[PDB]
Design a protein around this ligand. Structure first.
Ligand SMILES: C[C@]12O[C@H](C[C@]1(O)CO)n1c3ccccc3c3c4c(c5c6ccccc6n2c5c31)CNC4=O
Length: 300
């Protein structure tokens, strides 16, 4: 009460934050490209700005937690927090981040196959694992690992990007039980996430296996996890029947197929991440080491 705590409201003043264009839609909000030009001389820094799509009291509270999460993270493979803009005369909140020119990893794989080979895919895989190791040290569960939520700075560097679903583990437990679910990326979910609403570092590892799958399909049409799972379930199915069949499929060892051209060793990593036994999944530290040893064990 007596003394409130707030980010520096003069760091990014709304009157110097110039809207350039929309960048995309993410968890609970949208992202725009702006220029922050306090010397109004057509210089300044380009930045990315996240804003809520539905500014309810609950969503604003969740957004504050998301902002605090990102601000607490400093890592080469996590998108950089820059600050907050208290816009609308300090009666609104927007998140300011660094601008990463190539957008989502999902879109980069589709648009820039000319400069992607397996060496680059393994490099991105390694970087993703290291960012996830770092999140683990803060007891953060990302909860939406997918190439749509990873960002590309340049052909040599990717960064985990969208923290809209991220949760902090309770102090006394190794999982977070979500008790108000909204829109769920079910084709990235671990089985215990589908059946018990339990999220953990190990469920992030499951989803990382789907990310690895995505990388090695090169976002080829018809190979995405939704398209492949729907092909296995039956493209006709609708509503909850889809979830029922997905759960039944995963519990009895149905899995995404090996992508064309994917080495058996990379597919085996995917398979080990996709273990119904939560405790037997590898750690992100195991995965970073194994992937970097594979990379290092090539000639050169
Ligand atoms: C919504 C989304 O818009 C596109 C990619 C994206 O993640 C959607 O796939 N998107 C871009 C498309 C083309 C160029 C740049 C971006 C971009 C950026 C960010 C984000 C970001 C941060 C937090 C949540 C979502 C974010 N996006 C971002 C984003 C953060 N910094 C960015 O440069």
């Amino acid at each position: 009460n007596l003394y409130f705590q707030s980010m520096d409201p003069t760091q990014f003043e709304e009157r110097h934050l110039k809207f350039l264009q929309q960048l995309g839609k993410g968890n609970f909000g949208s992202v725009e490209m702006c220029r922050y030009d306090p010397l109004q001389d057509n210089t300044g820094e380009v930045v990315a700005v996240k804003k809520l799509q539905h500014s309810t009291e609950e969503h604003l509270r969740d957004f504050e937690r998301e902002i605090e999460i990102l601000k607490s993270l400093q890592h080469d493979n996590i998108v950089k927090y820059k600050g907050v803009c208290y816009s609308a005369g300090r009666r609104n909140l927007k998140l300011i981040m660094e601008y990463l020119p190539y957008g989502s990893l999902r879109d980069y794989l589709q648009k820039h196959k000319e400069r992607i080979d397996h060496i680059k895919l393994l490099q991105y895989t390694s970087q993703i694992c290291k960012g996830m190791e770092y999140l683990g040290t803060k007891r953060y569960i990302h909860r939406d690992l997918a190439t749509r939520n990873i960002l590309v700075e340049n052909e040599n560097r990717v960064k985990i990007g969208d923290f809209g679903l991220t949760k902090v583990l309770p102090q006394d437990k190794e999982y977070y039980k979500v008790k108000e679910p909204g829109e769920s990326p079910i084709f990235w979910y671990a089985p215990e996430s589908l059946t018990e609403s339990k999220f953990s570092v190990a469920s992030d590892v499951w989803s990382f296996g789907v990310v690895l799958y995505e990388l090695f399909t090169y976002i080829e049409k018809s190979k995405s996890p939704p398209a492949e799972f729907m092909r296995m379930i039956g493209n006709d199915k609708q509503g909850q029947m889809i979830v029922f069949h997905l759960i039944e499929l995963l519990k009895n060892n149905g899995r995404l197929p090996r992508p064309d051209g994917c080495p058996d060793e990379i597919y085996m990593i995917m398979t080990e991440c996709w273990n119904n036994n939560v405790n037997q999944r590898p750690s992100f530290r195991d995965l970073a080491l194994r992937v970097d040893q594979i990379r290092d064990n090539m000639a050169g």
